[PDB]
Design a protein around this ligand. Structure first.
Ligand SMILES: [Mg+2]
Ligand SMILES: [Mg+2]
Ligand SMILES: [Mg+2]
Ligand SMILES: [Mg+2]
Ligand SMILES: [Mg+2]
Ligand SMILES: [Mg+2]
Ligand SMILES: [Mg+2]
Ligand SMILES: [Mg+2]
Ligand SMILES: [Mg+2]
Ligand SMILES: [Zn+2]
Lengths: 92, 146, 229, 36
RNA sequence: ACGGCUUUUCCGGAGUGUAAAAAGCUCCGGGAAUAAGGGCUGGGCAAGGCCGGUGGCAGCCGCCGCGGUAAUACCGGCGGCCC
RNA sequence: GCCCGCCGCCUGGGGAGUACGGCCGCAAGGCUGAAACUUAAAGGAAUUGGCGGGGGAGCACUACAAGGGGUGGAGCGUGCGGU
């Protein structure tokens, strides 16, 4: 239901680097080493290959970012019906 | 181990030499005489310092605490080094803007170092643009030049 | 004092002694507190002290030194036990120290007070400071030492009106024995209250082990037991 | 090397013998590069 | 709350003071009039088991430790303690 | 243990017996030996329990051994997960 705002955009989880760090491919072609904020790190489990909202850092907004929201399967289908996400983006 | 030596009436030189020799094993004495702190202190022995803010950051508390502590990076005017300073208060980070000038001092932990659940931070902010930060947090005053 | 005379009279009439010393006290063959010491008797009935030193039951003559709770581990959890360290005295020449255990605090306090009476001792007092020579029993007559566990205690005579220069446990114990001024030195772990109290108690007891001459009694004004004006 | 018998205790660490062997291996490499 | 009193201090004058001034000191007129803050409040360590917010967030914390929707420990009100 | 002598060594845990310098050895190596930074404990003796692919004693057809009858394969009755 929430949508990206400003620098926020859609991303796909690619690899888990441990220590609360993730690898996420964005919808423009940049692989970013993102950090999981503690507020949502203690509530929601996240696996490899999920759609999330990536907010770039105010400094060096090219390789580092944060993950601020994750969607569910029903939300993924709803976005697919709306026309905001495509099969190519899911499959990379 | 036998009796403590030397005890003789005419053995003063050896006794003084022994006491001087084993005093170097005291870490407090060694650092004062060799002036080791003055050699590595970014503040150069001052109680307070003035600097310019470069950016804002946040530091996670150590286990088993949880939370983010708001801090800033400060470049010192007197020698150009860069240090990290904590911003005390509830919502105090909102009164800091990049390129402001601040006054910092020690944070007050054990042995003149860090305290609490945020090791690695040794200083705290006291003034912002020549106005007390505690007032700004409480009110009673407005930050100058907007 | 008037309350305690009738209190001792009330206790004496309804008490049935069980030991030889209790029988001696009951029949009136022993009439003073000082007559039960220095002859090897065993003291097992608390009523003896109640009859001979009734004022140790006053609320101001009793002190609860410390309270602690200790744990025993079992497959059904933790079993808790209370340890209470207490002391009594007449503020003149006699003092006792005791430890009691119980499942709840009140039982432990009662037993600790009870055991303090059975461990009662008498001491010597005087004045032996270099800068106060007054012949009055306001301090220890000379330097004494005691120890328990890792704690060593040394007591040094002091001038009149100086106060008790010692930790609080020592303050309470010395006050209950009738001493007003002292200097002290310590070694070891004083934060272990039981050992600190026992060391002070032993130092007080060791005043009887120092050999003295009749001249010294006159010189330092040594008093054994009650001051007896 | 100097003796630290406290290091031989096994609680919370690996065996001292092999740490010594590893350090000696490391010191060989520095010495070789120094001679070049 | 009623009735009374004083003027260190405050306001306006005379003398003395001072190289000259200013302070200070002695008198005269008016009038309770002109005058209290800073830190702390779980233990160490004196002082609340009260109310309203926040909800592992924000924050506190010399050290030990609080905060996960019923917070004596964070923010605020009302009380209280030390100087 | 109480007393009379002399020499050697130690001063919270790590970094570290490391880096740099020097002497010795054919080599492998030996002796001497810091700092920046990091940390609230590390370490000792003893107590109560729980555990051991440690020992001993005892017990149980929801344990075995000696036996009798079965369930697991099919269709259906009913309860559970999932969809
Ligand atoms: Mg059991
Ligand atoms: Mg002993
Ligand atoms: Mg050792
Ligand atoms: Mg409050
Ligand atoms: Mg108190
Ligand atoms: Mg070398
Ligand atoms: Mg079975
Ligand atoms: Mg069978
Ligand atoms: Mg079947
Ligand atoms: Zn005296």
């Amino acid at each position: 239901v929430p949508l990206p705002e400003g620098n926020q955009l859609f991303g796909v989880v690619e690899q888990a680097l441990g220590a609360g760090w993730m690898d996420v491919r964005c919808e423009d072609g940049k692989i970013r080493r993102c950090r999981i904020p503690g507020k949502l790190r203690r509530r929601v489990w996240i696996r490899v290959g999920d759609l999330v909202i990536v907010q770039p850092w105010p400094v060096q907004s090219d390789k580092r970012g944060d993950i601020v929201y994750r969607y569910t399967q029903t939300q993924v289908d709803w976005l697919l019906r709306k026309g905001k996400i495509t099969q190519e983006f899911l499959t990379g | 181990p036998g009796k403590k030596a030397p005890n003789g009436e005419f053995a003063g030189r050896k006794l003084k030499l022994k006491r001087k020799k084993f005093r170097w094993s005291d870490i407090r004495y060694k650092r004062r005489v060799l002036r080791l702190k003055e050699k590595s202190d970014p503040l150069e022995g001052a109680p307070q310092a003035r600097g310019i803010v470069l950016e804002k950051i946040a530091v996670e508390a150590k286990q088993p605490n949880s939370g983010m502590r708001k801090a800033v990076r400060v470049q010192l005017i007197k020698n150009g080094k860069v240090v990290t300073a904590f911003c005390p208060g509830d919502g105090a980070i909102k009164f800091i803007d990049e390129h402001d000038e601040v006054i910092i001092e020690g944070i007050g932990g054990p042995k003149g170092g860090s305290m609490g659940d945020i090791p690695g931070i040794r200083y705290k902010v006291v003034k912002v643009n020549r106005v007390s930060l505690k007032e700004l947090v409480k009110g009673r005053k407005e930050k100058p030049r907007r | 004092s008037q309350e305690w005379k009738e209190y001792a009279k009330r206790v004496l009439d309804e008490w049935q002694p069980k030991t030889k010393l209790g029988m001696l006290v009951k029949e009136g063959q022993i009439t003073d507190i000082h007559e039960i010491f220095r002859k090897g008797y065993q003291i097992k009935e608390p009523e003896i002290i109640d009859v001979l030193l009734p004022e140790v039951n006053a609320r101001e003559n009793q002190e609860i030194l410390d309270i602690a709770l200790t744990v025993r581990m079992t497959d059904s959890g933790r079993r808790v036990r209370f340890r209470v360290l207490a002391a009594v005295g007449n503020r003149d020449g006699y003092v006792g120290l005791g430890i009691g255990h119980g499942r709840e605090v009140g039982i432990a306090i009662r037993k600790a007070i009870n055991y303090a009476k059975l461990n009662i001792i008498e001491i010597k007092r005087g004045c032996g400071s270099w800068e106060c020579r007054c012949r009055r029993p306001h301090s220890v007559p000379f330097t004494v030492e005691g120890k328990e566990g890792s704690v060593r205690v040394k007591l040094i005579p002091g001038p009149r009106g100086l106060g008790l220069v010692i930790g609080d446990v020592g303050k309470k114990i010395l006050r209950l024995a009738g001493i007003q001024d002292v200097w002290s030195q310590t070694l070891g772990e004083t934060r272990t209250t039981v050992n600190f109290a026992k060391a002070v108690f032993n130092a007080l007891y060791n005043t009887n082990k120092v050999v003295v001459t009749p001249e010294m009694i006159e010189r330092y004004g040594i008093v054994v037991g009650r001051a007896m004006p | 090397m100097k003796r630290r018998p406290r290091k031989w205790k096994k609680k919370g660490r690996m065996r001292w013998k092999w740490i010594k062997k590893r350090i000696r291996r490391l010191k060989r490499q520095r010495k070789k590069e120094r001679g070049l």
